[PDB]
RNA sequence: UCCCCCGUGCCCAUAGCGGCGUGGAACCACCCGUUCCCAUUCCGAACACGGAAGUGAAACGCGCCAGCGCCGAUGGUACUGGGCGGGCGACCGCCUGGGAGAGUAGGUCGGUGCGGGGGA
RNA sequence: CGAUCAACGGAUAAAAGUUACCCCGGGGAUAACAGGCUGAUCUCCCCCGAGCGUCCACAGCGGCGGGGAGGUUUGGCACCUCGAUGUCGGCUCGUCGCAUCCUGGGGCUGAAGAAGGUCCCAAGGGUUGGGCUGUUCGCCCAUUAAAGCGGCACGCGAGCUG
RNA sequence: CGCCUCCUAAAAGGUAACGGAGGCGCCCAAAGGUCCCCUCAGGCGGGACGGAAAUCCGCCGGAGAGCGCAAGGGUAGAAGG
RNA sequence: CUGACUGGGGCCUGUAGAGCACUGAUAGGGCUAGGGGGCCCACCAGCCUACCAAACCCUGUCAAACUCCGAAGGGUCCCAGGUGGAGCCUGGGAGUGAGGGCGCGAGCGAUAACGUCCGCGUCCGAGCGCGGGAACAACCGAGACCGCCAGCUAAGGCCCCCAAGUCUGGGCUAAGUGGUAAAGGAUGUGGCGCCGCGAAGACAGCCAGGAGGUGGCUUAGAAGCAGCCAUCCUUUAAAGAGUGCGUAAUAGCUCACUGGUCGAGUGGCGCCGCGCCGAAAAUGAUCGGGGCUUAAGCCCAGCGCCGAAGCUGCGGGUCUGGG
């Protein structure tokens, strides 16, 4: 017995995995937001970023954008340029969108 | 006395066409099937009739993933 | 149609057909030993298509001859009970002048036409039933 | 007599009679059993004649268990047709029986009664039979 | 009460040769051991017809050991109706699931009225200690009419023995007898010809 | 490199059902709101945003339990590639090599890769 | 774009019957007769013993089922024969089988006797004349010890009949 | 009489008979493309007209529904709404 | 050198078998809708079941078009062995496109056909050349280049026809079984194995008794042989309220039974052997014949021999290859 949340999660992720690009996964809790860039071909996380690790503070949307910029900076340092956005169970909107936009501003390619 | 039967359709010659370990070129049909008895794996596309074919030159590999199904892959050479 | 009373006679048919009529028998000719009815056919070429019609017409006479002897028995009986003497004869006469319901079998006359020709009467048949015991019993 | 109340298909290929029974080889209900010693298609006519043979011996009393069921249709072309023109019509049903099957079982009855009833029933069947009584080997199954 | 049976170890001997020599191949095992054995056929038959799977059989091994076992499985030759293999379950101090004979005490009143006592279970599955194995379990069937039934819930269990089947499991029933008076209606009973289940645009 | 939690993968029920117990510092959840972005064929349930008074009740995580589900030998057999025989046949045997399924003993209330936050 | 070219690789744009008045080329690659293989059907004999037979399963019977025999029926197959194997019935002449119609011997009998029933042995000889019908078959008349059943290319047309 | 599905087909493919069973000669301007969102049948209990079955509520539920039509394969980690 | 075939390794499969998780089938229970029949009722509720009977469950089963399972095998690829009247590639020339028997797997048929239609194989076809099978295309043996008055074998055989043992060791069968068949029947006969019953003397014969209450649902007058319902008990063996003659009245004989006798084993399963009945068709019979009985039959174990156009020896021909 799965839920709409797990089904929606499998649905969007399976489609992402199929293109073979490195995936930018985003987890969004009530307080924080987390992002890890994953090589599903080895099952390994390459670069990480989160509000909980950056001690970010204020408005959730502006916070997300900043963790997005941070993830980009650390990614480019590793030669990671092209990526595929994994919105998971979340609509592309608000905080998740902000993180994506922040990642793009940093030169991350998608 | 007569028959109300006597009909049958042409055999369709479905099945796997390239077995695990076989050297294929991009485009080689790997499996002919009805529905997804095998699912497309790495470097394997699927046509509108569920046909699996190689996307790259390489070697065929099969994999049984339980409830996730059986997959056909091509490993580049 | 049960077989213990049937002797079936086979042999060659009679008429056109060529060398097949000459050689192959194919003329079934059954004989129903208890009733005596003999229905015998040669119409289709096979004696087994001929066996079918032979059996299917023996029944049509085993049933016809029994239904006769039973309806011949139904008219010999009924003709006696009703009696052609329906001018004035056998059982009872019902007076509507003076109400004398009488049965000439015994004699017993009474005025119960009101209670009989307007209802039941199971007790006024009793003497006709009782006088008919002592009719048989005493002799 | 015995025949399926309904079926998915009217007519059935004949198949084969290889080997000992798949199952049903041990006494499972009554005290004595009638075991088949050679393979055959057993007709519902034969089954019911064996049954009637047993109840008419018991006269009143006992319990008979029939452990084979004729679900296989038997086909025969009309007399005097030639080959072809399709499969013949269903004329009856048979129970496929192979060596070792317990076909009938009796209970509630003395030994001599059980021996005699099953013997007479064996005479109504187209195969050699053997009378057996319940064993620990049977209970252990 | 308790039976003894000389057993012997086997290794590479072919089972066919053993049985042609009058020896019944077998295996003896539990969670600690597993050994290929064989016993003399006629000797085992004398024991098993009494012991069945209900009473303990101790195996007198050639190395001097003596192990208490229960017969756990007997494979029958389907054709010849003869045993070809035995599983001996080596018993130990732990409680064990096993089958215990049912003794149907009394004559059912339905039987007095002409009925028949159908003995659905002649034993019952039970968890119990090997030191605690009863010989039977009595059951009072004299109250059963045609057609009444007893279940495993109605079983009075002795001390230290625990029912291992659902108490809903029926264990006996008193059924109506066979009767020639019914033959006449059964022979003149007409059967409706079998209906074929529809396929395609019919279903 | 150890313990807890949060992500995300692998094995594809030995991982599930049920029952019980446990956890809110942290994390996660409910939770508070519905101004704003966004949303309901009605409904802030969901989706979404802004929040932090409360609660681990639900959910989730972590334990324990074998009633169910799942897994499951070892023996022996069926069947059989090849080789032979027997029977008038329906069919039955022998040799050599392979070898089930059901059942029995038993096994299981998961294991593991990566990256986070926390703890020693 | 125009195909029930649906006989769906679709001979013409355009097409049904009859021949006993018949013809040729072929085939025993393929039917009808006979044989053969088979034995479903046919005949006969067994197995079981439900029940009948006032009583009594088996004098005589034999429910439902079971196993055979034969190769006389009608079929199945298409194996020799289509550069020919003449077919029904009758006549003539037989010969053989025995599952025996008579006669001879015998067992049981619900065998008093006489006459029967049934079963065993037995194939030596015998087994009538007529009416009807092309008939085989069958019905009928008058008899009889009896009025047997089958095989032989349903014996027999280089013997006849037609 | 052509085409499809299943079997006979003897675990690759293929495989005959006047063998066993069913369908096709269409359909859809959305019943198509792409994004997003949603999960069924059935069973039990609750519920005005209202029932075996309208709609509503709750619990149980891996797919036995649905997928335009035959059958098969496939399928809710959608191909279904 | 890539071939058929073979070794290893990977993968593909849903058959045999088996199973019942699905589709259906399914007997017998349990449990329980729905009806049915019976109660009490219509006040609408209320009770019975051994009638039928959905689901569900248990026991027990079935299936080409059912599968939770699932072989042996097969296919295909890779590396290897494999130099063969092998393989690939391109051209020239065909013939064939009526097949048949056998073994196995099925369908059809009737678990009929010297039947029919497929699959795998095989042989005939074309090996109607050779040895065996009495004779006989396809069963067994065996692929004939020619010559030999040399040898070794194959199937099959070794008493005579008729080449080779009237060979050797232990059995079985009296039916000429062998030398032509089924259900089923039968103290034929021969083995094993395993239970009963057996010292207050058995089975079989002689001997003495073998009774008393003596009637019932009870009657077509028969307590006991008349149809049932009957099965109590006793006169200090303890002898039926009854199996065979009279009976819609009785005798009397008889067993089961008890004792007395004379002086030694008896019955039952199960596996196996070999025989018996069941067993009737048409020109004259017969296993090929003659003939065969501790076999000249059958089973087991042995040594030897005969036996072909197979193999060897010797000589020759021709082609190919190698010198
Ligand atoms: Mg939320
Ligand atoms: Mg038709
Ligand atoms: Mg067909
Ligand atoms: Mg067609
Ligand atoms: Mg085809
Ligand atoms: Mg085809
Ligand atoms: Mg097909
Ligand atoms: Mg395949
Ligand atoms: Mg498509
Ligand atoms: Mg496509
Ligand atoms: Mg692998
Ligand atoms: Mg790969
Ligand atoms: Mg005429
Ligand atoms: Mg003509
Ligand atoms: Mg004819
Ligand atoms: Mg068939
Ligand atoms: Mg039959
Ligand atoms: Mg048939
Ligand atoms: Mg015809
Ligand atoms: Mg014909
Ligand atoms: Mg046909
Ligand atoms: Mg048929
Ligand atoms: Mg029938
Ligand atoms: Mg069977
Ligand atoms: Mg029989
Ligand atoms: Mg079982
Ligand atoms: Mg985690
Ligand atoms: Mg707590
Ligand atoms: Mg919890
Ligand atoms: Mg907290
Ligand atoms: Mg707190
Ligand atoms: Mg607002
Ligand atoms: Mg604002
Ligand atoms: Mg708050
Ligand atoms: Mg909690
Ligand atoms: Mg969650
Ligand atoms: Mg298992
Ligand atoms: Mg094993
Ligand atoms: Mg084999
Ligand atoms: Mg066979
Ligand atoms: Mg083997
Ligand atoms: Mg082996
Ligand atoms: Mg298997
Ligand atoms: Mg297993
Ligand atoms: Mg678990
Ligand atoms: Mg849990
Ligand atoms: Mg994990
Ligand atoms: Mg990994
Ligand atoms: Mg950390
Ligand atoms: Mg046109
Ligand atoms: Mg049409
Ligand atoms: Mg055409
Ligand atoms: Mg045309
Ligand atoms: Mg077309
Ligand atoms: Mg055409
Ligand atoms: Mg075509
Ligand atoms: Mg044409
Ligand atoms: Mg044209
Ligand atoms: Mg044209
Ligand atoms: Mg034109
Ligand atoms: Mg025309
Ligand atoms: Mg035309
Ligand atoms: Mg013309
Ligand atoms: Mg004319
Ligand atoms: Mg004319
Ligand atoms: Mg003229
Ligand atoms: Mg003229
Ligand atoms: Mg004219
Ligand atoms: Mg002319
Ligand atoms: Mg001509
Ligand atoms: Mg011409
Ligand atoms: Mg000509
Ligand atoms: Mg011919
Ligand atoms: Mg032709
Ligand atoms: Mg012909
Ligand atoms: Mg003809
Ligand atoms: Mg002809
Ligand atoms: Mg003909
Ligand atoms: Mg003919
Ligand atoms: Mg002729
Ligand atoms: Mg001829
Ligand atoms: Mg002839
Ligand atoms: Mg013949
Ligand atoms: Mg016959
Ligand atoms: Mg015959
Ligand atoms: Mg014959
Ligand atoms: Mg017949
Ligand atoms: Mg006979
Ligand atoms: Mg008899
Ligand atoms: Mg009588
Ligand atoms: Mg009598
Ligand atoms: Mg009687
Ligand atoms: Mg008789
Ligand atoms: Mg009869
Ligand atoms: Mg028969
Ligand atoms: Mg003939
Ligand atoms: Mg004839
Ligand atoms: Mg014919
Ligand atoms: Mg004929
Ligand atoms: Mg012909
Ligand atoms: Mg011909
Ligand atoms: Mg032919
Ligand atoms: Mg001709
Ligand atoms: Mg000529
Ligand atoms: Mg000529
Ligand atoms: Mg001529
Ligand atoms: Mg001539
Ligand atoms: Mg005679
Ligand atoms: Mg005489
Ligand atoms: Mg006489
Ligand atoms: Mg006399
Ligand atoms: Mg007299
Ligand atoms: Mg006499
Ligand atoms: Mg006699
Ligand atoms: Mg006699
Ligand atoms: Mg004579
Ligand atoms: Mg004579
Ligand atoms: Mg004569
Ligand atoms: Mg005359
Ligand atoms: Mg005349
Ligand atoms: Mg005449
Ligand atoms: Mg005249
Ligand atoms: Mg006539
Ligand atoms: Mg007349
Ligand atoms: Mg006279
Ligand atoms: Mg006389
Ligand atoms: Mg004559
Ligand atoms: Mg004829
Ligand atoms: Mg004749
Ligand atoms: Mg003639
Ligand atoms: Mg004649
Ligand atoms: Mg003539
Ligand atoms: Mg003539
Ligand atoms: Mg002549
Ligand atoms: Mg002539
Ligand atoms: Mg002449
Ligand atoms: Mg002539
Ligand atoms: Mg004339
Ligand atoms: Mg004329
Ligand atoms: Mg196929
Ligand atoms: Mg297939
Ligand atoms: Mg295939
Ligand atoms: Mg195959
Ligand atoms: Mg192909
Ligand atoms: Mg159609
Ligand atoms: Mg859309
Ligand atoms: Mg629902
Ligand atoms: Mg409701
Ligand atoms: Mg309501
Ligand atoms: Mg409702
Ligand atoms: Mg579906
Ligand atoms: Mg439809
Ligand atoms: Mg090479
Ligand atoms: Mg190769
Ligand atoms: Mg190769
Ligand atoms: Mg290989
Ligand atoms: Mg099978
Ligand atoms: Mg099932
Ligand atoms: Mg089961
Ligand atoms: Mg089967
Ligand atoms: Mg099966
Ligand atoms: Mg199949
Ligand atoms: Mg299958
Ligand atoms: Mg398994
Ligand atoms: Mg394999
Ligand atoms: Mg292979
Ligand atoms: Mg391989
Ligand atoms: Mg090589
Ligand atoms: Mg060559
Ligand atoms: Mg060649
Ligand atoms: Mg070369
Ligand atoms: Mg040339
Ligand atoms: Mg040339
Ligand atoms: Mg040609
Ligand atoms: Mg031909
Ligand atoms: Mg052809
Ligand atoms: Mg052919
Ligand atoms: Mg062939
Ligand atoms: Mg021949
Ligand atoms: Mg063959
Ligand atoms: Mg075959
Ligand atoms: Mg087939
Ligand atoms: Mg038959
Ligand atoms: Mg043929
Ligand atoms: Mg044949
Ligand atoms: Mg055949
Ligand atoms: Mg052909
Ligand atoms: Mg030729
Ligand atoms: Mg040859
Ligand atoms: Mg050849
Ligand atoms: Mg020849
Ligand atoms: Mg010869
Ligand atoms: Mg010779
Ligand atoms: Mg020959
Ligand atoms: Mg020869
Ligand atoms: Mg030859
Ligand atoms: Mg040569
Ligand atoms: Mg020599
Ligand atoms: Mg030799
Ligand atoms: Mg000789
Ligand atoms: Mg000599
Ligand atoms: Mg000697
Ligand atoms: Mg004799
Ligand atoms: Mg002889
Ligand atoms: Mg003889
Ligand atoms: Mg016998
Ligand atoms: Mg016999
Ligand atoms: Mg004997
Ligand atoms: Mg004997
Ligand atoms: Mg009485
Ligand atoms: Mg004999
Ligand atoms: Mg000797
Ligand atoms: Mg020689
Ligand atoms: Mg020589
Ligand atoms: Mg040579
Ligand atoms: Mg030389
Ligand atoms: Mg040379
Ligand atoms: Mg050469």
Curated annotation (Swiss-Prot), chain A:
InterPro entries: Ribosomal_uL18_bac-type, Ribosomal_uL18_bac/euk
GO CC annotations on file: cytosolic large ribosomal subunit
MF-aspect GO terms: 5S rRNA binding; structural constituent of ribosome
Keyword vocabulary terms for this entry: Ribonucleoprotein, Ribosomal protein, RNA-binding, rRNA-binding
Gene Ontology annotations of biological process type: translation
Ribonucleoprotein is among the record's keywords: yes
CDD domains: Ribosomal_L18_L5e (cd00432)
Family to which the UniProt record says this protein belongs: Belongs to the universal ribosomal protein uL18 family.
PANTHER family xref list: 39S RIBOSOMAL PROTEIN L18, MITOCHONDRIAL, LARGE RIBOSOMAL SUBUNIT PROTEIN UL18M
Protein task: This is one of the proteins that bind and probably mediate the attachment of the 5S RNA into the large ribosomal subunit, where it forms part of the central protuberance.
Quaternary state and interactors: Part of the 50S ribosomal subunit; part of the 5S rRNA/uL5/uL18/bL25 subcomplex. Contacts the 5S and probably the 23S rRNA; has been isolated in a complex with the 5S rRNA and uL25.
Record-given protein name: Large ribosomal subunit protein uL18
Gene: rplR
From Swiss-Prot, chain B:
GO biological process annotation, one example: translation
Keyword match Ribosomal protein: yes
GO molecular function: structural constituent of ribosome
Domain of life from the UniProt record: Bacteria
InterPro entries in the cross-refs: Ribosomal_bL27, Ribosomal_bL27_CS
Record key words, sorted: Ribonucleoprotein, Ribosomal protein
Annotated PANTHER family: LARGE RIBOSOMAL SUBUNIT PROTEIN BL27M, RIBOSOMAL PROTEIN L27
Protein name: Large ribosomal subunit protein bL27
Gene source species: Thermus thermophilus (strain ATCC 27634 / DSM 579 / HB8)
Lineage, highest ranks first: Bacteria, Thermotogati, Deinococcota, Deinococci, Thermales
Curated annotation (Swiss-Prot), chain D:
GO molecular function, one term: tRNA binding
Family note: Belongs to the universal ribosomal protein uL16 family.
GO biological process: translation
InterPro entries: Ribosomal_uL16, Ribosomal_uL16_bact-type, Ribosomal_uL16_dom, Ribosomal_uL16_sf
One GO location term (cellular component): cytosolic large ribosomal subunit
Name assigned to this protein: Large ribosomal subunit protein uL16
UniProt organism field: Thermus thermophilus (strain ATCC 27634 / DSM 579 / HB8)
Quaternary organization: Part of the 50S ribosomal subunit.
Pfam families: Ribosomal_L16
Swiss-Prot record, chain E:
GO molecular function term, any single one: structural constituent of ribosome
Top-level division of the source organism's lineage: Bacteria
GO BP annotations listed: translation
Keywords tagged on the record: Ribonucleoprotein, Ribosomal protein, RNA-binding, rRNA-binding
One of the Pfam families matching this protein, by short name: Ribosomal_L25p
Basic and acidic residues: compositionally biased ranges: 195-203
Keyword match Ion transport: no
Region span, Disordered: 184-203
Gene Ontology, cellular component aspect: cytosolic large ribosomal subunit
Family: Belongs to the bacterial ribosomal protein bL25 family. CTC subfamily.
Function description: This is one of 3 proteins that mediate the attachment of the 5S rRNA onto the large ribosomal subunit.
Subunit structure: Part of the 50S ribosomal subunit. Contacts the 5S rRNA; has been isolated in a complex with 5S rRNA and uL5, 5S rRNA and DNA binding protein II; 5S rRNA and uL18; 5S rRNA, uL5 and DNA binding protein II.
Protein name: Large ribosomal subunit protein bL25
Gene name, Swiss-Prot/TrEMBL: rplY
């Amino acid at each position: 017995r799965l839920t709409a949340y797990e089904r929606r999660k499998f649905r969007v992720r399976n489609r992402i995995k199929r293109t073979g690009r490195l995936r930018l996964s985003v987890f969004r809790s009530l307080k924080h937001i987390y992002a890890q860039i994953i090589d599903d071909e080895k099952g390994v996380t390459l670069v990480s970023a989160s509000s909980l690790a950056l001690k970010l503070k204020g408005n959730k949307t502006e916070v997300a954008r900043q963790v997005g910029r941070a993830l980009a900076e650390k990614a480019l340092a590793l030669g990671i340029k092209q990526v595929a956005f994994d919105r998971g169970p979340y609509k592309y909107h608000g905080r998740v969108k902000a993180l994506a936009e922040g990642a793009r501003e940093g030169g991350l390619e998608f | 006395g007569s028959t109300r039967n006597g009909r049958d359709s042409q055999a369709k010659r479905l099945g796997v066409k390239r077995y695990e370990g076989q050297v294929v070129r991009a485009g080689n049909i790997l499996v002919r099937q009805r529905g997804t008895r095998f699912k497309p794996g790495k470097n394997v596309g699927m046509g509108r009739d569920f046909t699996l074919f190689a996307l790259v030159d390489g070697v065929v590999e099969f994999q049984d993933r339980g409830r996730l199904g059986r997959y056909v892959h091509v490993r580049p050479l | 149609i049960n077989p213990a009373d049937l002797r079936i006679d086979t042999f060659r048919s009679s008429g056109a057909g060529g060398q097949h009529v000459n050689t192959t028998d194919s003329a079934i000719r059954i004989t129903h030993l208890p009733t005596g009815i003999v229905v015998e056919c040669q119409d289709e070429r096979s004696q087994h298509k001929n066996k079918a019609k032979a059996l299917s017409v023996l029944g049509a006479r085993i049933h016809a001859a029994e239904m006769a002897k039973r309806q011949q028995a139904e008219a010999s009986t009924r003709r006696n009970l009703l009696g052609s003497g329906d001018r004035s004869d056998r059982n009872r006469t019902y007076n509507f002048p003076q109400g004398r319901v009488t049965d000439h079998r015994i004699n017993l006359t009474l005025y119960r036409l009101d209670e009989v020709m307007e209802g039941k009467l199971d007790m006024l048949i009793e003497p006709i039933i009782q006088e008919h015991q002592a009719d048989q019993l005493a002799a | 007599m015995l025949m399926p109340r309904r079926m998915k298909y009217r007519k059935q290929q004949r198949g084969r009679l290889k080997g000992a029974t798949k199952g049903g080889d041990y006494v499972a209900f009554g005290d004595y059993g009638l075991v088949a010693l050679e393979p055959a298609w057993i007709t519902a006519q034969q089954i019911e004649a064996a049954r009637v043979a047993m109840v008419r011996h018991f006269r009143r009393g006992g319990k008979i268990f029939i452990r084979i069921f004729p679900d296989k249709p038997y086909t025969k072309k009309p007399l005097e047709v030639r080959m072809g023109k399709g499969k013949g019509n269903v004329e009856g049903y048979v129970a496929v029986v192979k060596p070792g099957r317990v076909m009938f079982e009796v209970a509630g009855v003395t030994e001599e009664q059980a021996m005699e009833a099953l013997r007479i029933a064996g005479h109504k069947l187209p195969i050699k039979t053997k009378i057996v009584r319940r064993d620990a080997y049977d209970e252990a199954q | 009460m308790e039976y003894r049976l000389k057993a012997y170890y086997r290794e590479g001997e072919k089972p066919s040769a053993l049985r042609r020599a009058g020896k019944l191949p077998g295996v003896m095992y539990n969670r600690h051991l597993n050994r290929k054995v064989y016993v003399d056929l006629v000797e085992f038959d004398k024991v098993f017809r009494q012991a069945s799977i209900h009473h303990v059989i101790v195996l007198e091994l050639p190395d001097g050991q003596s192990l208490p076992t229960l017969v756990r499985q007997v494979n029958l030759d389907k054709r010849r109706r003869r045993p070809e293999h035995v599983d001996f379950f080596v018993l130990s101090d732990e409680p064990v699931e096993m089958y215990v004979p049912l003794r149907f005490v009394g004559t059912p009143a339905g039987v007095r009225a002409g009925g028949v006592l159908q003995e659905i279970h002649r034993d019952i599955l039970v968890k119990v200690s090997p030191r605690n194995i009863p010989e039977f379990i009595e059951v009072d069937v004299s109250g059963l009419e045609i057609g009444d039934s007893l279940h495993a819930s109605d079983l009075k269990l002795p001390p230290g023995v625990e029912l291992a089947v659902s108490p809903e499991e029926t264990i006996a029933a008193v059924v109506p007898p066979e009767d020639v008076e019914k033959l006449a209606e059964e022979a003149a009973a007409e059967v409706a010809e079998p209906e074929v289940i529809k396929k395609g645009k019919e279903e």
